[PDB]
Each structure stands twice: as structure tokens, then as C-alpha cells.
Design an enzyme around this catalytic site. Structure first.
Site, mmCIF file in Angstrom:
data_model
loop_
_atom_site.group_PDB
_atom_site.id
_atom_site.type_symbol
_atom_site.label_atom_id
_atom_site.label_comp_id
_atom_site.label_asym_id
_atom_site.label_seq_id
_atom_site.Cartn_x
_atom_site.Cartn_y
_atom_site.Cartn_z
ATOM 1 N N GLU A 173 -5.697 -3.814 -6.689
ATOM 2 C CA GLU A 173 -6.021 -4.506 -5.452
ATOM 3 C C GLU A 173 -7.038 -5.613 -5.777
ATOM 4 O OE1 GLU A 173 -4.497 -3.946 -2.742
ATOM 5 O OE2 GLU A 173 -3.834 -1.814 -2.848
ATOM 6 N N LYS A 192 3.158 6.450 5.161
ATOM 7 C CA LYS A 192 2.239 5.496 4.560
ATOM 8 C C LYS A 192 2.844 4.108 4.759
ATOM 9 C CE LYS A 192 -1.348 3.931 2.507
ATOM 10 N NZ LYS A 192 -1.223 2.873 3.512
ATOM 11 N N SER A 193 2.066 3.217 5.366
ATOM 12 C CA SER A 193 2.488 1.852 5.596
ATOM 13 C C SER A 193 2.007 0.916 4.488
ATOM 14 C CB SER A 193 1.979 1.369 6.947
ATOM 15 O OG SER A 193 0.568 1.371 6.993
ATOM 16 N N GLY A 194 2.531 -0.297 4.523
ATOM 17 C CA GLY A 194 2.060 -1.353 3.657
ATOM 18 C C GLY A 194 2.199 -2.708 4.333
ATOM 19 N N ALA A 195 1.317 -3.614 3.967
ATOM 20 C CA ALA A 195 1.384 -5.012 4.372
ATOM 21 C C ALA A 195 0.872 -5.854 3.211
ATOM 22 C CB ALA A 195 0.532 -5.283 5.604
ATOM 23 N N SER A 215 0.779 -1.217 0.000
ATOM 24 C CA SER A 215 0.000 0.000 0.000
ATOM 25 C C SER A 215 0.822 1.285 0.000
ATOM 26 C CB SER A 215 -0.938 0.038 1.192
ATOM 27 O OG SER A 215 -1.913 -0.991 1.084
ATOM 28 N N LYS A 230 0.103 3.853 -2.692
ATOM 29 C CA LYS A 230 -1.054 4.734 -2.698
ATOM 30 C C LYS A 230 -0.665 6.210 -2.616
ATOM 31 C CE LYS A 230 -3.862 0.949 -0.987
ATOM 32 N NZ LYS A 230 -4.279 0.135 0.178
ATOM 33 N N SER A 245 -5.657 3.346 4.262
ATOM 34 C CA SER A 245 -5.197 2.285 3.353
ATOM 35 C C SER A 245 -6.343 1.568 2.651
ATOM 36 C CB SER A 245 -4.235 1.296 4.019
ATOM 37 O OG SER A 245 -3.243 0.946 3.074
HETATM 38 B B1 LIG Z 1 -1.883 -2.042 2.140
HETATM 39 O O1 LIG Z 1 -0.638 -2.828 1.998
HETATM 40 O O2 LIG Z 1 -1.851 -1.336 3.463
HETATM 41 C C1 LIG Z 1 -3.208 -2.957 1.968
HETATM 42 N N1 LIG Z 1 -3.200 -4.151 2.826
HETATM 43 C C2 LIG Z 1 -3.904 -5.268 2.727
HETATM 44 O O3 LIG Z 1 -4.731 -5.308 1.857
HETATM 45 C C3 LIG Z 1 -3.483 -6.307 3.743
HETATM 46 N N2 LIG Z 1 -3.629 -6.200 5.031
HETATM 47 O O4 LIG Z 1 -4.406 -5.149 5.444
HETATM 48 C C4 LIG Z 1 -5.012 -5.293 6.772
HETATM 49 C C5 LIG Z 1 -6.299 -6.096 6.567
HETATM 50 C C6 LIG Z 1 -5.454 -3.867 7.092
HETATM 51 C C7 LIG Z 1 -3.991 -5.805 7.744
HETATM 52 O O5 LIG Z 1 -4.474 -6.418 8.731
HETATM 53 O O6 LIG Z 1 -2.753 -5.641 7.521
HETATM 54 C C8 LIG Z 1 -3.025 -7.605 3.204
HETATM 55 C C9 LIG Z 1 -3.091 -7.792 1.841
HETATM 56 S S1 LIG Z 1 -2.563 -9.370 1.504
HETATM 57 C C10 LIG Z 1 -2.235 -9.609 3.170
HETATM 58 N N3 LIG Z 1 -1.702 -10.744 3.656
HETATM 59 N N4 LIG Z 1 -2.559 -8.619 3.969
HETATM 60 K K LIG Z 2 -0.380 8.388 6.965
#
Ligand SMILES: *[B]([O])([O])[C][N]C(=O)/C(=N\OC([C])([C])C([O])=O)C1=[C]SC([N])=N1
Ligand SMILES: [K+]
Ligand SMILES: [K+]
Ligand SMILES: [K+]
Ligand SMILES: [K+]
Length: 263
Positions: free
Chosen positions: A141, A209-212, A45, A48, A105
Site C-alpha cells: 500500500e 471484503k471490498s476493494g476500491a 483491498s 487483505k 480496510s
Molecule cells: B482497499 O481497496 O479497500 C483500500 N482502498 C483505498 O486505499 C482507496 N479508497 O479507500 C477509501 C479512502 C476508504 C475510499 O473512499 O474508497 C483508494 C485507493 S486508490 C483510490 N482511488 N482509492
Molecule cells: K467484512
């Protein structure tokens, strides 16, 4: 400071996975410290911010309006849409969508915004045209978070991302009022509290801005500094770890504790 690299490389050890790190001087662009700075990592993310940069560039060019309303519906919604799922009936404006995308996000917000500029390919063209020949968005996404090993889709490098963020926030790329709106969205946050913000001293500024994503992928981009004014950019990415979210979060927060201590 090399002592921060003691912590960055320890994070890679503990997480069992690559870590990439950049600390840049915001004013000069000087690389103050790095680790794997030219290796690719999934953006997740963190893209973004770039997206809303491209949108703001269109606004400046008279090709978009922040107040323009987009109407969407149930089927558009993708996973993790905490803001957009509340506004199906009457839609959201472009500024509201960037606020949701950056500050929450929100994933549907990102897709809606991506549609406005022509898709991933056009985000990549925008990046190339501003001198980032590295960062690329390929997918939408949810798939852009898949973090496949060795895949260059939907990746950046710490150095490219830090360079690009410096340009968007402080260069002539965007008008002043728009580069300010980008950093203002980044200053708001409901999701990155466990990361750099948890290490940030009182009175300091941060815009982040974070990402996961999949496969342990986690990251953050930020502009931060003391007395209410940003003065450096930090970029941290990791991918491949089997660690818990809390464990990955803590490693990032500990890198942050270190870079603050040695500021
Ligand atoms: B972005 O990278 O911030 C969007 N993130 C996601 O879609 C994912 N996690 O988001 C939440 C649900 C908020 C979280 O708990 O981290 C994600 C996409 S695929 C994955 N394993 N986690
Ligand atoms: K922010
Ligand atoms: K150095
Ligand atoms: K609708
Ligand atoms: K409603």
C-alpha cells in the site's frame, strides 16, 4: 441464473468498463454462473483476506502468534489508516491488525501484516503453493491499487479468487479454529454496507471484503447464504470506469439484488 447475467452485463455497459463475476457453490465448488471469469482485475483491498490467510497459516505452523505485538510509528502510516493511526503509542497485536485490515480496510495494517510474512513475493508464493497459479501480489500500500490497464501486478481473476476463498474458508489449508477466525473477521464490517450487504435478506449470513482503487476499480469477495450459514461465494470486480463511487457501488448492489432474487 441467466437473469443475473442480464444484470452483470448491464453493469459493464453502464460503467463503460469490464466487469468480472463468479457465483460458486461453497460445498461442491461448482461454477453456478460467470462473466469474464478468467480475465485479470486488480484485487485492491480484497487481497487483505488472502494476507490474513497466509498469516493464519504461519500461526498454525508455529511461525506466528496472533497475540504478538507490533510497534510502529508515524512515518509507517500510509493513506487510509483509520485504526492504526489511533495506536501509535502502544502498537497493535497481529489479530488486531487483521481485524483492522479486513473489517476497516486499514492500509497500514495491511503493510504491517505483509511485512510479517516477507512481503508481496511471499504472499504470491503462499498462493502458488495452495494451488492458485493466477493471483499475485507485487506491491505494497498504496501502489498496489494503481490498476494500470494490462498490468498483471496485484491482480487476480474472478475464478481464481473465488477458488482460493473457498479453499481458505473450508479446506484443510488452515486449521478449523483459524479458518473460523478468518471468516469471523470477514463477517464484521464498517465499509461494505453499500455493496452486497445492502441487498442481503434478514437472517442471511455474509462474510465479505471490498476493494476500491484507481481508475474506477471496485470489487467484493463474499461467502453468503440463508439462515445464518454461508453456502455460496460471489466475486465481483470492475476496473476502468469513470463512474462515481456511488454509481459503481449501486451496480454491485444491483448484481447482488439479482443473485438473491434468483438464488
Ligand atoms: B482497499 O481497496 O479497500 C483500500 N482502498 C483505498 O486505499 C482507496 N479508497 O479507500 C477509501 C479512502 C476508504 C475510499 O473512499 O474508497 C483508494 C485507493 S486508490 C483510490 N482511488 N482509492
Ligand atoms: K467484512
Ligand atoms: K451457468
Ligand atoms: K510507536
Ligand atoms: K494515544
Amino acid at each position: 441464473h441467466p437473469e443475473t447475467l442480464v444484470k452483470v452485463k448491464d453493469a459493464e455497459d453502464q460503467l463503460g468498463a469490464r466487469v468480472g463475476y463468479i457465483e460458486l457453490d461453497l460445498n461442491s465448488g461448482k461454477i453456478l454462473e460467470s462473466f469474464r471469469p478468467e480475465e485479470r482485475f486488480p484485487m485492491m483491498s480484497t487481497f487483505k483476506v488472502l494476507l490474513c490467510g497466509a498469516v493464519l497459516s504461519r500461526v498454525d505452523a508455529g511461525q506466528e502468534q496472533l497475540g504478538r505485538r507490533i510497534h510502529y510509528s508515524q512515518n509507517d502510516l500510509v493513506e487510509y489508516s483509520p485504526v492504526t493511526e489511533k495506536h501509535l503509542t502502544d502498537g497493535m497485536t497481529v489479530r488486531e491488525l487483521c481485524s483492522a485490515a479486513i473489517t476497516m480496510s486499514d492500509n497500514t495494517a495491511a503493510n504491517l501484516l505483509l511485512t510479517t510474512i516477507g512481503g508481496p513475493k511471499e504472499l504470491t508464493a503462499f498462493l502458488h503453493n495452495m494451488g492458485d497459479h493466477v493471483t499475485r501480489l507485487d506491491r505494497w500500500e498504496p501502489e498496489l491499487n494503481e490498476a494500470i490497464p494490462n498490468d498483471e501486478r496485484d491482480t487476480t481473476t474472478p475464478a481464481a479468487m473465488a477458488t482460493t476463498l473457498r479453499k481458505l474458508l473450508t479446506g484443510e489449508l488452515l486449521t478449523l479454529a483459524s479458518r473460523q477466525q478468518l471468516i469471523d473477521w470477514m463477517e464484521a464490517d464498517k465499509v461494505a454496507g453499500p455493496l452486497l450487504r445492502s441487498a442481503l435478506p434478514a437472517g442471511w449470513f455474509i462474510a465479505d471484503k471490498s476493494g476500491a482503487g484507481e481508475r474506477g476499480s471496485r470489487g467484493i469477495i463474499a461467502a453468503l447464504g440463508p439462515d445464518g450459514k454461508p453456502s455460496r461465494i460471489v466475486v465481483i470486480y470492475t476496473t476502468g470506469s469513470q463512474a462515481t463511487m456511488d454509481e459503481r457501488n449501486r451496480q454491485i448492489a444491483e448484481i447482488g439484488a439479482s443473485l438473491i432474487k434468483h438464488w
